[PDB]
Write a protein that binds this DNA or RNA. Structure first.
Lengths: 142, 50, 48, 141, 58, 154, 97, 146, 338, 292, 49, 157, 165, 48
RNA sequence: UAUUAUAUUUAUUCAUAUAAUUAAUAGGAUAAUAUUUGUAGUUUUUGAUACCAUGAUAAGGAUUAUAAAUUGAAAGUGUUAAUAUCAUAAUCAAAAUUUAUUAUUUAUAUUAAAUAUGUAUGUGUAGAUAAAAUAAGAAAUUA
């Protein structure tokens, strides 16, 4: 686009505020994940039928040497609190370790737990223009 | 669990100032409009509601 | 079964190379070059 | 098309400041979820107030006669049981059978948000001041 | 509708109230049909061969 | 009467300009004429406006009559007075219809829309089940549930 | 095909794609031509048997003719045998009348 | 000179017929009938691959059940959890959706034994550590042997 | 002076050949004569070129799982590889093993010709995954590391020509080339009868002899290698009582000319002739006498001839059918060959 | 009779990028195949005529009698014996029918002349080119490559159509002639430029229903409820019909000739005729079960 | 109906012609266009820098 | 690689082969994945032959197998890349920049119509078109008509 | 009404007759029809827009299932779902590669057959012609980037390159 | 124009222009190509 | 002057891109015989790249018109055909808002299928701004 956050900003145009077909997006920017939906907790941003098998960042399918980080698509379960191990999510910027485990997390994916869009923004990545802009929209004071 | 009694960085974030005015651009103030009806003039208020 | 794979490119090209080493590329599509393009009968009635 | 500028480097240690920030964010979500489920299920089990509107028939009839006497003399226990919630209220009305279809066609029911205030409220500020930190989709008191 | 005997079933309702007052949801996510889902949308309606839409298959 | 949320205030001139779409809505002119033939009133105004708009619809697909290049210019404010008599006829009729409905609603004991004054029962407008806990025009807090208007015998 | 997919590497698999797309084998039958006599001397299908057939088959029949569309196998001969079997089997079923 | 035939001449039709073969699958001779038992279970190479839906793969699917049981042991398919068999250990494993059984939600479901309340306003203020004292007698349910 | 990606390579032919070969030049590619392809890479450098070249299922990726490196720097942030032993405490390992990627041969047509399930497509022909030695698809050690470099790699050097060959692959590619790259007639002149098909062949012959035709046919549906001739003998024998000329003719044709003419044996022809009799088929009697007569191609090239005593028994059966069925012209024809 | 009577319907649908290409293509192929179909039914018609020429009680085959009288019972409450003549009138009536249909064809095949040929009406011509409504792929698509503005892409929308018109030649020939079909298939090569052909063939066949293998027996004792047709029951719970029925019956020791028939549900003589290699039944033997 | 009556009794064409019942309003909507927000008439908002 | 002897002008044009072999692997694992999903999800008893306890152990085994199916392609067909073969332009399916029948994008396809590279017929920009279906009921109607002919018309045996 | 689906044998009635659920069973046997048993009786909806000719899009066949709880996730869906084997996805796959000649044959094979040599791309021969000419008029701008450097850093026993000027 | 060249088999501008056949000339068959008949190669396959 | 009308209506809260190796041909049954069953010469060049690397198709109404007629244009808007000589950045799922060039669903009934947006009740409410004479229905101050 304008400021290439990725190497694909080098490659993809914006098309303004291009209106999109309902649920057809080349970039799945799950900007709604950490949405507390009180009576809809085991439903909102979760698997549909309660009696489903687990997703597949949940079983070592082969003879791995290991991995650097899990996805958010692997549910949080008893082994994610008691085992107290390292479970990492590729969130902005590099990775996010779930090292303060709790039991309420048990059952959902880690999407409802890894904040997609942070309330703290580092002006260390923003431009001399973006900072004034975030002041404009009310994010950083000035 | 055991919700920590001190918050480190998340609660400290800059407060997004609530929208001041209403309506378009959240700037349309709270003062009378063209739409206000009158109960002192006629059995049908003017301007009437449809 | 032979029709599912008789149009193989290399089968085409071994027909081509066989016609080549038998010295015949006149009937063949690729291996013929018709460089003499024929002209038309000019008209005495419309010479303009 | 101007060559899109590379996003500058993320910075020093910010990968871990985001670690700790999100950390205590889900930490805060722990309590937020706890309190929100508290508020939603108390909302659920609390006996609500009237879903219908007393501005239309047959619920404009006096609070003594007609469909009101049928309400007192067949369903007065069921509504207090099922907490006056408009959904079970209207379904008990559908199963009372002696009103017909009217429990939609003639009955006027409060809007979804005028319906979910607890029993016997008298303000208009209740719905407009219900707590905004209990992410109940408005399913709290 | 031929229905399984020994199964307690309803009939298609009569009063236009019970559908308003049932717990029936609305189709929120994408809209699939097991054959149409090959073409992935109306606008990008795919076709293997340029056959007529009024084709009378033998 | 179902629609009881808030409504948009449009002047008679633009409520009439909608022409044969809603102003000369034939099925609405009819359904308000039915209120008159029930109550037993002469439909002089609605019939006058219906005549005018039947003319206007019959002579909408046609061109205006030619103007003459008069520096003295009389046609202008004469057709002006013509139009604005038609307009005044329709202003009177607008008011008659509104009055008859806001009176018949107090007679049928039916509730009008929000802040729709009915001088048959209440000197101010009907405020109830509103998107605001303040009066939309008086800035008076609303009672819960909606305020009650008529008797209770039905 | 005889434009472009007639001749090269893609000729093969395009012939596959074509004939598989066309692999359907429609079988139409005249129920009046089931109204025949079994060589046992019994009429093969009587009015009651035609009733049992039309009621066994919901949408396969129409305008006095029964249609089954062999859509199973990629090879048309195998759709042929499959449709012949299914037709014969719905006949054995309807013949209980 | 500007001519093109309206109809390909017989001669060039004859060239275009001759130059190329005739496929044996254009004749459809038939005297034996349909082979009810073998012809469909004929050799695995010259097999009639069903095509389209799963509902036509009847041999392959029995085959898939058989292979998958022949390789996949219960010592592997054991651990595979449901969502509910893991969601069981939430402090609120069960709360009725607000649709129907919103009138069936109970207070007793609320684990007030794991959070705390201030009575001056009625709010639950914080949550005790349950990941400490969390003692389950059936970490995986009673059907799980490892 | 030079910035080069590959340091060193390897020769394809060895010095017992090159030292005599070099004395004639190679007529090389005009625009780039020296062609350092994939075959010439080292073992390690080509393990790199094979590890990478896939999206998340080439172990070249730090978080692909079979990755070798333990450290990866993410924009000046280091992440280190959580191994399987730390991981299994929350990602319980289910690893069926090397047999869980190789589907049965009876699901090839359902899986579109394939048997493997690898990221890397496994062509069964030689000329596609051929690295230096032709790529043999060994279905018993198909790893994710992929040592044999037989895979149809995605983004490797010299991948474009083979991706084009794969897309220009034939209609029946995996099945035909997989069949023929195995199961060939041995120089002893014999048919390929194997070890693991003998018990299944026993099942087939016993069932068909008992007369359980469809049962034997459902079992024959599992004939992966070739059956010995007696299996066809029994699978045609079962048809005799019911008169299944159609099922019988198809049982014959499946080995006849399709399976190295195993089915071309006098007694199988005798069974199918009997079915022609019991089905009352003047034209099928003659078809079976026709396969008996054979032609040069079978009778000489594939050397699937029939012992003259069996020729005679089948001819007497044909005459006994025909002159019993009054088919004077065709009986006289067979006696003409007599 | 005539135009609504057929045995093999070839609807050759010619596809071309331009409807004028296929409008003229269909005329070319329709005259080719009118000259073909005329010759092929001239052949079949001279054959049929010379056949019907000399039909009487002295012109018939044993195969045909054995097919006409392969029935256990018929209309008179008794099995029918069809001679050379009762089958003579049958085959002559059939051949009268076939000649009537064939000559109606040829009459349609000479009627179109260069002056007033109407190939879009079969009642005049054999065959008739049926139009087929074109495949038409209208597609909106942008033209601008503006990366900033979606509006300025939208307003640039151009509609363009991938057309592909067809024509359907319907040869309703009342008898399948593989030689004509051979002449039809190699239009696949002399067809015009950017024009192809899909051949629809609808040809009458014979599929036999048969006793042993596809039985019309009573319902069983145990009823197949809804459980036997659940999901994946189509492949687990059922076999691929038909049922394999053991056509080899083992003789019991103290058996009779009519006891094995009273056991297998057959007539004694029919069991004799499906086991015609034996005269008296010995123990331990196998017997071919007649389908009857 | 006007053409039906002209066809049943011709000389009634003249009053039908004159009254314009046999008249065809040569009108249609604006076709379906994505460059229009309602598809028919309105072009999307224009903004100067 | 490393930009030495590039034969094509778009280094990204390797992604088209990459995508077509993505499609191949999708066709290869498609049947297996669909039957795996069916059997793992089936709740009402499969048949009178496999039911209950055997059903739970079998379901979990085939789920273990669907998980062990390494190389499996379970990314939905609407989620794969969709790029123009010619100038390597990507097009989001469902929006004007994707010609469906030629598998090209607004850009390359616009180039190929304003030059003579495709044979199309220009029709009016505001109307509906020549197809009576596309005129009749919009776009879902032609979707319906297409599925009706490709699937629904066969009285499936 | 809430009616129990009852079905009396053909034996209880004092006239036997084939009953319709048994006929349903015979049909789901013959054509391998799955009988979904959770099918409620109150949901016999038909697609009016498709089944009712009072809309512009009357199709006659229920062009979809009026059932909001739908998705490919369901096995009842997966059962009646056309698979992408031999669909347009395959045709596109096997004919839509950036260069079309690489779908009809191999470029080297075609070259060695029609010409002699295997020719470069038009783009490559562009680069090579520019090499031929911009190294004719001038030099000293190049670089030496190779696939394998062992033979350049290590020339053969001879081959002492020329120093230019 | 371009490195990724024109393809002479799909493109109407090529197929139609004066060095090819236009759609309004009557698009017939121009000359019957009997190639597989003048001299057919012998059947020699790579795979024995 | 004539060959002829804009002062009306409906409008304004607007956001989405990611985890490096593009260099080549290699035919298998019903074909009168190739183990060519399994076709083995490494390492002399460099542009479309993270980088200069020409061209070529949009948006934008203000006076060629009334009858059998359409209220959308060339001035070129990212990807394209000759300038080389910093670096591999390219979707196979789950993704990080600063980007002018955007029509949001408004109070009787509110989460079931690849998951699908929890915030902004407020007198229709500053300033400046949007669209349209086309199946809808509009009428009078030419340069």
């Amino acid at each position: 686009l304008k400021m290439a956050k990725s190497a694909f900003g080098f490659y993809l145009a914006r098309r303004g505020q291009r209106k999109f077909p309902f649920l057809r997006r080349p970039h799945i920017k799950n900007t709604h994940a950490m949405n507390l939906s009180a009576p809809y907790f085991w439903s909102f941003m979760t698997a549909k039928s309660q009696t489903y098998f687990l997703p597949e960042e949940n079983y070592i399918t082969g003879d791995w040497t290991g991995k650097f980080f899990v996805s958010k698509l692997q549910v949080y379960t008893l082994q994610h609190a008691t085992s107290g191990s390292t479970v990492r999510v590729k969130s902005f910027p590099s990775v996010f370790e779930l090292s303060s485990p709790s039991r309420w997390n048990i059952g959902k994916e880690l999407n409802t737990l890894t904040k997609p869009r942070m309330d703290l923004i580092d002006e260390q990545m923003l431009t001399k223009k973006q900072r004034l802009d975030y002041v404009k929209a009310g994010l950083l004071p000035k | 669990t055991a919700t920590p009694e001190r918050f480190s960085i998340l609660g400290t974030t800059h407060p997004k100032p609530k929208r001041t005015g209403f309506g378009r651009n959240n700037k349309m103030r709270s003062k009378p409009s063209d739409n206000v009806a009158w109960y002192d003039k006629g059995p049908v208020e003017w301007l009437p509601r449809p | 079964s032979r029709y599912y794979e008789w149009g193989r490119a290399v089968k085409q090209f071994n027909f081509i190379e066989f016609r080549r080493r038998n010295g015949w590329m006149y009937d063949l599509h690729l291996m013929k070059n018709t460089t003499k393009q024929v002209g038309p009968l000019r008209d005495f009635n419309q010479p303009d | 098309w101007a060559k899109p500028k590379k996003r500058p480097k993320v910075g020093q240690g910010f990968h871990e400041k985001a670690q700790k920030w999100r950390d205590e964010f889900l930490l805060d979500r722990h309590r937020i979820l706890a309190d929100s489920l508290r508020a939603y299920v108390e909302f659920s089990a609390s006996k609500r107030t009237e879903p219908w509107d007393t501005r239309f028939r047959p619920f404009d009839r006096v609070e003594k006669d007609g469909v009101y006497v049928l309400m007192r003399h067949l369903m007065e226990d069921k509504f207090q049981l099922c907490n006056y919630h408009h959904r079970p209220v209207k379904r008990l009305f559908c199963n009372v059978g002696l009103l017909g279809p009217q429990v939609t066609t003639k009955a006027r029911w409060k809007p979804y948000r005028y319906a979910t205030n607890p029993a016997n409220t008298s303000k208009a500020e209740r719905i407009f001041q219900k707590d905004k930190t209990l992410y109940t989709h408005g399913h709290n008191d | 509708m031929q229905q399984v005997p020994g199964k307690i079933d309803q009939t298609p309702f009569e009063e236009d109230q019970t559908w308003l007052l049932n717990p029936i949801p609305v189709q929120q996510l994408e809209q699939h049909h097991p054959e149409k889902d090959l073409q992935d949308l109306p606008f990008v309606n795919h076709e293997q061969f340029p056959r007529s839409l009024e084709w009378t298959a033998p | 009467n179902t629609f009881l949320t808030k409504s948009v205030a449009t002047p008679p001139i633009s409520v009439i300009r909608t022409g044969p779409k809603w102003w000369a809505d034939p099925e609405r002119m009819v359904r308000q004429k039915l209120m008159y033939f029930t109550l037993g009133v002469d439909q002089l105004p609605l019939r006058r406006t219906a005549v005018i708009q039947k003319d206007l619809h019959r002579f909408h697909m046609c061109k205006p009559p030619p103007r003459i290049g008069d520096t003295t210019g009389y046609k202008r404010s004469r057709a002006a007075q013509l139009t604005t008599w038609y307009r005044r006829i329709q202003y009177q009729e607008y008011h008659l219809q509104h009055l008859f409905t806001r009176h018949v609603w107090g007679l049928v004991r039916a509730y009008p829309g929000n802040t729709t004054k009915i001088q048959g029962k209440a000197d101010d407008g009907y405020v109830g089940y509103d998107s605001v806990p303040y009066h939309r025009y008086n800035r008076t807090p609303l009672p819960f549930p909606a305020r009650e208007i008529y008797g209770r015998r039905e | 095909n005889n434009l472009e997919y007639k001749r090269y590497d893609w000729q093969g698999w395009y012939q596959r794609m074509v004939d598989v797309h066309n692999r359907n084998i429609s079988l139409r039958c005249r129920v009046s031509d089931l109204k025949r006599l079994d060589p046992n001397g019994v009429p093969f299908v009587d009015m009651q048997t035609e009733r049992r057939l039309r009621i066994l088959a919901e949408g396969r029949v129409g305008m006095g003719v029964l249609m089954l569309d062999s859509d199973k196998y990629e090879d048309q001969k195998d759709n042929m045998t499959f449709g012949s079997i299914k037709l014969s089997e719905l006949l054995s079923d309807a013949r209980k009348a | 000179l500007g001519y093109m035939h309206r109809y390909t001449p017989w001669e060039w039709i004859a060239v275009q017929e001759a130059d190329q073969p005739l496929i044996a699958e254009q004749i459809r001779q038939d005297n034996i009938g349909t082979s009810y038992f073998f012809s469909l279970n004929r050799y695995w190479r010259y097999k009639a691959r069903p095509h389209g839906y799963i509902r036509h793969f009847d041999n392959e699917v029995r085959d898939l059940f058989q292979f998958v049981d022949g390789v996949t042991p219960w010592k592997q398919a054991q651990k595979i959890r449901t969502y509910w068999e893991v969601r069981a250990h939430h402090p609120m494993p069960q709360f009725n959706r607000p649709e129907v059984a919103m009138h069936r939600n109970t207070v007793g479901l609320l684990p007030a034994h794991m959070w705390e309340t201030d009575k001056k306003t009625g709010k639950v203020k914080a949550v005790k550590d349950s990941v400490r004292d969390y003692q389950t007698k059936t970490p995986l349910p009673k059907w799980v042997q490892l | 002076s030079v910035t080069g990606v590959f340091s060193k390579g390897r020769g394809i032919g060895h010095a017992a050949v090159t030292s005599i070969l070099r004395y004639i030049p190679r007529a090389r590619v005009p625009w780039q004569p020296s062609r350092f392809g994939r075959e010439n890479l080292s073992a390690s450098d080509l393990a790199v070129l094979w590890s990478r070249g896939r999206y998340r299922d080439g172990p070249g990726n730090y978080n692909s799982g079979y990755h070798t490196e333990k450290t990866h720097v993410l924009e000046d942030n280091t992440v280190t590889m959580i191994p399987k032993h730390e991981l299994e405490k929350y990602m319980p390992d289910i690893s069926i093993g090397p047999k869980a990627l190789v589907t049965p041969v009876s699901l090839m047509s359902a899986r579109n010709g394939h048997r493997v399930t690898h990221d890397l497509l496994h062509s069964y022909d030689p000329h596609i995954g051929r690295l230096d030695k032709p790529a043999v698809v060994d279905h018993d050690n198909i790893t994710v590391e992929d040592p044999n470099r037989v895979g149809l790699n995605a983004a490797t050097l010299d991948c474009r020509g083979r991706i084009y060959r794969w897309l220009r692959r034939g209609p029946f590619f995996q099945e035909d080339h997989y069949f023929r790259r195995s199961l060939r007639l041995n120089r002893d002149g014999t048919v390929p009868t194997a070890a693991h098909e003998a018990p299944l062949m026993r099942k087939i012959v016993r069932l068909a002899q008992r007369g359980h035709l469809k049962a034997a046919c459902e079992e024959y549906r599992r004939v992966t290698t070739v059956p010995p001739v007696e299996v066809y003998r029994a699978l045609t024998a079962c048809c005799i009582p019911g008169g299944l000329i159609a099922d019988a003719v198809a049982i014959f044709e499946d080995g006849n000319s399709k399976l190295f003419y195993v089915a071309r044996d006098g007694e199988v022809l005798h069974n199918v002739m009997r079915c022609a009799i019991k089905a009352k088929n003047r034209v099928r009697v003659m078809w079976v006498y026709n396969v008996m007569r054979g032609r040069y191609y079978e009778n000489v090239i594939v050397r699937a001839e029939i012992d003259p005593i069996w020729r005679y028994r089948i001819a007497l059966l044909a005459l006994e059918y025909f002159l019993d069925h009054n088919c004077a012209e065709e009986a006289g024809t067979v006696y003409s060959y007599l | 009779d005539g135009i609504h009577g057929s045995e093999v319907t070839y609807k050759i649908v010619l596809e071309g990028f331009w409807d004028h290409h296929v409008m003229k293509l269909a005329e070319d192929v329709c005259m080719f195949l009118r000259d073909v179909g005329r010759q092929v039914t001239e052949e079949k018609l001279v054959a049929v005529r010379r056949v019907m020429e000399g039909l009487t009680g002295g012109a018939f085959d044993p195969e045909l009698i054995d097919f006409f009288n392969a029935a256990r019972a018929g209309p008179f409450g008794r099995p029918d014996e069809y001679d050379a003549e009762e089958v003579a009138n049958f085959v002559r009536a059939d051949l009268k029918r076939l000649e009537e249909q064939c000559l109606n064809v040829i009459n349609r095949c000479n009627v179109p002349v260069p002056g007033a040929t109407n190939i879009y009406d079969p009642q005049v011509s054999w065959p008739y080119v049926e139009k087929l409504e074109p495949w038409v792929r209208m597609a909106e698509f942008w033209t601008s490559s503006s990366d900033t503005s979606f509006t300025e892409l939208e307003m640039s929308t151009a509609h363009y159509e991938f057309r592909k018109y067809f024509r359907v030649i319907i040869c309703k020939l009342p008898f399948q002639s593989t030689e004509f079909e051979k002449r039809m298939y190699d239009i696949r090569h002399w067809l015009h430029r950017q024009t192809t052909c899909e051949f629809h063939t609808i040809y009458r066949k014979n599929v036999i229903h048969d006793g042993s293998v596809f039985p019309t027996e009573h319902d069983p004792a145990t009823p197949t409820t809804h459980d036997h047709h659940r999901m994946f029951s189509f492949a687990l719970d059922w076999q691929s019909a038909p049922v394999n029925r053991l056509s080899v019956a083992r003789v019991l020791e103290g058996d009779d000739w009519e006891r094995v028939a009273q056991r297998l549900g057959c007539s004694v003589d029919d069991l004799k005729e499906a086991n015609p290699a034996i005269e008296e039944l010995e123990a331990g033997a196998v017997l071919n079960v007649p389908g009857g | 109906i006007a053409n039906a009556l002209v066809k049943l009794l011709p000389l009634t064409r003249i009053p039908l012609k004159k009254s314009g019942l046999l008249s065809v309003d040569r009108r249609r909507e604006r076709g379906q266009f994505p460059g229009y927000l309602d598809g028919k008439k309105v072009k999307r908002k224009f903004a100067k820098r | 690689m490393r930009h030495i002897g590039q034969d094509v002008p778009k280094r990204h044009t390797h992604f088209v082969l990459e995508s077509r072999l993505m499609y191949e692997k999708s066709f290869r694992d498609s049947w297996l994945h669909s039957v795996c999903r069916a059997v793992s999800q089936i709740d009402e008893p499969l048949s009178k032959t496999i039911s209950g306890t055997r059903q739970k152990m079998l379901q979990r085994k085939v789920t273990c197998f669907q998980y062990n199916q390494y190389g499996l392609f379970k990314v939905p067909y609407y989620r794969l890349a969709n790029v123009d073969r010619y100038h390597a332009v990507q097009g989001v399916p469902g929006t004007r920049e994707w010609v469906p029948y030629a598998n090209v994008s607004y850009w390359t396809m616009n180039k190929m119509v304003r030059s003579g590279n495709l044979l199309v017929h220009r029709v009016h920009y505001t109307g509906w078109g020549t197809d009576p279906h596309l005129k009749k009921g919009g776009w879902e109607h032609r979707w319906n008509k297409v599925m009706q002919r490709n699937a629904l018309q066969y009285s499936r045996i | 009404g809430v009616h129990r689906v009852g079905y009396t044998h053909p034996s209880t009635l004092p006239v036997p007759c084939a009953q319709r659920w048994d006929l349903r069973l015979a049909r789901a046997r013959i054509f391998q029809e799955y009988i979904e048993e959770k099918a409620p009786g109150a949901w016999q909806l038909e697609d009016e827009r498709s089944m009712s000719p009072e809309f512009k899009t009357f199709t006659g066949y229920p062009m979809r299932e009026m059932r909001p709880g739908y998705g490919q996730n369901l096995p009842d869906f997966i059962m009646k779902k056309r698979l992408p084997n031999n669909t347009h996805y395959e045709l596109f796959a096997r004919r839509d590669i950036p260069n079309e000649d690489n779908a009809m044959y191999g470029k080297y094979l075609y070259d060695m057959t029609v010409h002699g040599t295997s020719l470069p791309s038009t783009y490559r021969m562009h680069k090579d012609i520019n090499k031929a000419q911009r190294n004719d008029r001038k030099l000293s701008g190049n670089r030496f980037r190779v696939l394998c450097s062992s033979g350049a850093k290590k020339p053969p026993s001879g081959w002492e390159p020329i120093p230019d000027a | 124009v371009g490195y990724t060249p024109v393809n002479p088999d799909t493109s109407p501008m090529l197929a139609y222009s004066q060095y090819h056949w236009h759609y309004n000339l009557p698009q017939g068959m121009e000359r019957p190509h009997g190639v597989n008949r003048t001299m057919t190669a012998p059947y020699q396959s790579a795979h024995s």
